[model samples]
Target chain A: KIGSVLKQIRQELNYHQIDLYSGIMSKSVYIKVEADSRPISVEELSKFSERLGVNFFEILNRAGMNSVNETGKEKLLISKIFTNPDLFDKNFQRIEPKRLTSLQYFSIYLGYISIAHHYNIEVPTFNKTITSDLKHLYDKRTTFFGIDCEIVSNLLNVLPYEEVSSIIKPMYPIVDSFGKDYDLTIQTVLKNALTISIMNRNLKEAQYYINQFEHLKTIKNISINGYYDLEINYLKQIYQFLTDKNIDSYLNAVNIINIFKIIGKEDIHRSLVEELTKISAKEKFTPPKEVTMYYEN
Target chain B: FKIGSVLKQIRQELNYHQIDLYSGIMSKSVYIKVEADSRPISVEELSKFSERLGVNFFEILNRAGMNSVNETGKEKLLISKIFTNPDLFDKNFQRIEPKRLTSLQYFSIYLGYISIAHHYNIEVPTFNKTITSDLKHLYDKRTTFFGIDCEIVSNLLNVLPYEEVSSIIKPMYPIVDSFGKDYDLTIQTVLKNALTISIMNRNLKEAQYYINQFEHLKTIKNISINGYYDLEINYLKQIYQFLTDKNIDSYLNAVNIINIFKIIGKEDIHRSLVEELTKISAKEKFTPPKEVTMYYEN
Candidate 1:
């Protein structure tokens, strides 16, 4: 638990070693200082920052030992989120009925962090600020990471199969009105929902989402219905960018599948699915049941 | 009195009437009334006739009633060196090396011919053997009527000098020869000669030999100017080969030539070339092409 806290704090400060060492004294004495053997004197602690190029008080505050205690509120909020099962469940357990999975809520939280991180906005402390911001701006929020859910919905509404097609038609107007600001949120939500839906053995819902995504750009007038050559060409480009950007491999594959399924491109989807299935089967702790169901159907 | 008789004897000795001599040699009309006895024939007309007829230029001038035999002989000797010796002609032609000819040189020649043809109100023939033959016919007529030698006639036409001729002709020989029965070497030689005469004042024979040398080099070993194919394809293949050898990174850092070509669809070519290489991976296993592996140690 203590290690996890230290790690989190380290990551929060962008993972600088100096930030980890700022509370220590005897800057030249490397071994004992890190070992916490020779306790840092007040005078020595003042000079601790000289070696590690960070504020001594900030490190102490992060380590929960600072006299000023500046990060107490932030630390307390993180602790609440981690420890309280009820709150965690309340925040993340709600499932979007259309997709039949809790991924929508989970992705919303994830999307918040991603978008916040993108714009260099600090992840809001999970207190009044976050809750208020989410509550007030959630409806207006568009993209999670620059993907548009409205676009995904517009694509979904145009699926060939009527059963899958009906669910998205109602949402078409909203999607059409959705601007770039909300694209990322919408895409991430739709992607997570479709993946979870697939896991739940809801192939219709999953296909609906995927197919909608495929044709979303077409409905948006950004692309023509001809064979989707441009999207196919950009497949490797998107894959490369995702890899470079350090997106989790599973999420990246899921995103790719969403994009592919939306375009109704069987070839590329089959290729990516083969590769992704191999990875998922090898590394996944819990395999999605619908993956087998997909082949069976 | 003596000068008039000397002119009369020179004209008689050349075996021509004054009107005929004037028309054939001077490229001018003859008049019944003569100018002053000491009236010097223009050096231009004298040089043209001397070069065409192969007369001792000094003897021709002395017969034409000029007292300056000393300067005429020396000048004729220099002009003779330019016209007669193949090596001297080669050297003069070398002034424009076609192999190293820049785009500017090709464009300049293209423009110069076009301008001259336009100026003379002559129809500039399209670049084909028959068209070239027609142009050569016109050139021949011009040369014969003016009593000029082939070399002197080519010089007046401002044809490409021999070096430029050799450079351009050498690269084109293989391509031209590839047509085989449709185009023989004699026709190739003649067409090349005509092209050279029409374009620049260089030796056709030397140019033909250089083209043969290029062919010989190819026959000695399978080689090409930039390693066969068109420039675009060759460049793409080069980059792909460089990548396969893991030499691209170092080469790009060192040379930056790849970066320049990287623009203008070269990268697409490079990618497609790499795809082709990957497709032909097995082919590389047995008897790889010569350029597939770099021979340069450095």
Candidate 2:
């Protein structure tokens, strides 16, 4: 295989075997080298590479015979997709999208789509087969990476909960196997899933991710775990309050809102208060004095 | 002025009366005399007195121009680094020897040898039986600080087999979890190192159990000064998957880590990882992708 590559280079360069290898080796050996019948020594290969102006190691690399392998180009491109869409757009426009591998196109789509979603811009279907195309990228048998999480998370914004759940739920087994390195990133996705479910008033779907968070397990980030613990518990209480209009569950939600305020989350405290009040107004109900007192300030 | 005057100055700044500040640590009469620089104070008394005053004992000594005590503090920090930083193991090994080795020095030496052994894949015959018992003894009484360091106990987990480390380390979780805010970084390092060691031993079950610990620590923002441990843990996971399952994505993940290492100016780590990956690919007969080959050759 290497010999064929060398021969192709040699003939393309108009070199006879003697012309390339005269000082390095004799006529018989040089012919064997070009024919792939004999092994080429390092010294002779280097001489031939120098004479022919080709990197023999690169040839071997392309032929899959080198000891070292290069990382794929598609993986490299994914790392460059930045938070700024302008930067990503400028760089992304120059690339030939048609030539992109399915995985590359999936990464580009996720990047562009996420930025568009954030800015409230209309999303275009870049790849007609993107749903299945994205699914094909993560081979189920392999473990998940941060990039895989982003794909699920980005889709959560635009796709229906059921469609996103179908794609993301099966990944739970491997996601559980993920170590602490991805804990924060994974938590972001899980929290996003919960928020979307709660927003849609889909209690059944919301509980699924609530259970996932309870099982997900975290450490080192004590404050984060406590924050999520409070947030998730608040979400649960709200779920119960909404389910049966229970005053006690509503009070429990108020208590955690007080706790959030104590911990300096004034913004979170106000938002939860507003949300609870909005629901109360629609249902023609008023919270008890204790609950009202917690939020009134 | 005298060290006592400095102590009095801090006490007045905190609005702490002399009796209120040092009544339990010492009587007012002795404190007044000490504050007046009328009597000498023992180093032991000064240490306890500083604790009562809510000040670092070394800070008191430094403000008093006690140069020898300050040097001891510096030496203690340097020795502590031997446990904190595995990268310094080689230099520490060159520096310390057995005859005068303190217990902390022994911990450093043992950790150093274990790191060296793990790197070269060699046997550390000296690590058997006695040293394990000695380290276990020290670890059990770690809270008392009689030559026990929390970082040392955590660092010991490295290169130790799953069961041996788990026995000593599992009991520390509850203790560390309850620690005050002051110990956040130390608590984080312990959990982070524990998670890493679990992965290193290929104890996926224990890794799964320890995995949540680091994630929990991350919930408290600003615990880590930077994301070095985060990068390391992520890189190790990828390396583990690549080595065990021969997963292509994992290999690519590791390449990304090495590239980041270079970007961050960790040239030594970058080169060694590339070399290690190349050697492993050769051993497994796995052909690396062309881009990896290009990066490796460059």
Candidate 3:
């Protein structure tokens, strides 16, 4: 089928057999080239494109081939959704949700994939297609992307310990493969990986991110583009709280108030700060009940 | 006689149980008889038993006829001496080689290092989890042997310096159900080492935080020490005092340790260091005493 598509594209572009590879190849090779013999080299393709007045990339695009448009679109969506987890909780319908594409809904899966990958959280197995809602249904299945999607049907409530624990073995290659490059981007993803590693009692991974953070800072001085915590310092604050020490360590922790001034955090951050504070004060510090759920049994 | 001793050593040193070493083919009673030397074992069972331990079992059997209580008695006495006067282990070695030691051996080694380190400075590394792991293992096995080092090793590994203990082993280092109320040995052995690394690495705030934990552990222990701290405890208290004070001894001691322990050519610290050595040599009072054991003096 690919061989037929190549032949069909060449015919419409106004190129003839031997008309394309003039003086560049023997007449016999030209026949095999048209017949989809697989030995075409970069040089042969270049000469053929020159004679046909078409570029190789353009030719491939016209051949019912990938335009890389899906990849570019996914990258844009992942960046937006990863940086703004708040996007899922918002009621776009009340604000006159813009009529969007499979377009509006297909990316909700990518968002879930992106958010889950942030802490290396395993996306639950489901009887669903990643590309299911081609028509942009904008339903819960399409839009639910956060870690708590399995619980907290309403995003405004405190996620309980047991319910949140009900949680990975199948792997999705699309999000994972793209995540290699995802490691290089805006900050929240890196922050979550470190924090979650800490919560899971995996310090080597936490130290790894700390080392990686230094390497990234040496290469480029930049702030994490994810500002869901524009109102409150997110992981940067959490990391400092966990690792800081001194009489002023609590000064670093604080003289002693007890809660995070988190912006959109309805459930978690405040409780996390209180526990961390307790540990810092040489008092009792119990890890949040739900965080234990994220851990593997 | 040879098989029994070697087998007994392997069992106790490895913390192996009757089931762990002899579960399937025989009953606990059978293994107990073999250990008790009440019953003779067949070659086939012995061969299979050797493979299970992964420690050259056949060689131990062959050496059974060559039993030398003469050599063994001396080694056992030597071990006791070293356990009591742990500095003997380090007089030959620079830093403590923890991995090769058995459970109680490690307990004594850490205890000695604390005592010796208190009296003499050690060029401790900044922050490392190797020390963290070794400390945890040492503390767990500390109670296996009862000596002066045992008490101090327990105190040194007290709770605090949450960062150094690692969340990985945090549950393992549980804040004893009676931590605050009792003089609890810490899971936070890394505090002093963490403090050392932080200070050496210029992570001053982290150093101060570790020192805070150190003070807290000391306070709780002091409540138990009943205020009459022994030489080893006083030595630890002195180390803490110097760490907090940043005294001339702390810096000079750190220099002396690095000078002697690090296998390098003359360093720049020794350039002006030669002038300092005059004072160091006289201050150390080098006699390399024949009996360099802690109890002799402490």
Residue-pair clashes per prediction, in order, are 26, 29, 8
What overall lDDT, based on C-alpha atoms, would model 2 receive against the true structure?
A: 0.64
Report the CAPRI category for model 1.
incorrect
DockQ of 3: 0.00
Better of 1 and 2 by lDDT: 2
Q: What are the per-residue Cα lDDT tens digits for candidate 1 across B96-199?
A: 22321233223233333333444445453442323244334344333112111222223323443344333323323333223222223322333334332322
Worst 10 residues of 2 chain B by lDDT: B173-182
lDDT of 1 by residue, A40-76 (tens): 5555555544444556566555655532342333224
Against the true two-chain complex, what DockQ does each candidate achieve? 0.01, 0.01, 0.00
Query: Which CAPRI category fits model 3?
Result: incorrect
Q: What is the lDDT of residue A193 in candidate 3?
A: 47
- Which regions of candidate 3 fall more than 4 Å away from where they truly are? A1-91, A94-167, A172-195, A202-297, B1-298
Q: What is the C-alpha lDDT profile of model 2 across B44-87, one tens digit per residue?
A: 77887788779888788768766435433454455556555656
TM-score of chain A of each: 0.26, 0.55, 0.30
The parts of candidate 1 lying over 4 Å away from their true place are: A1-162, A172-297, B1-233, B236-298
Q: Rank the candidates by lDDT, best first.
A: 2, 3, 1
lDDT of 2 by residue, A256-292 (tens): 8788888899888887777666655554455544445
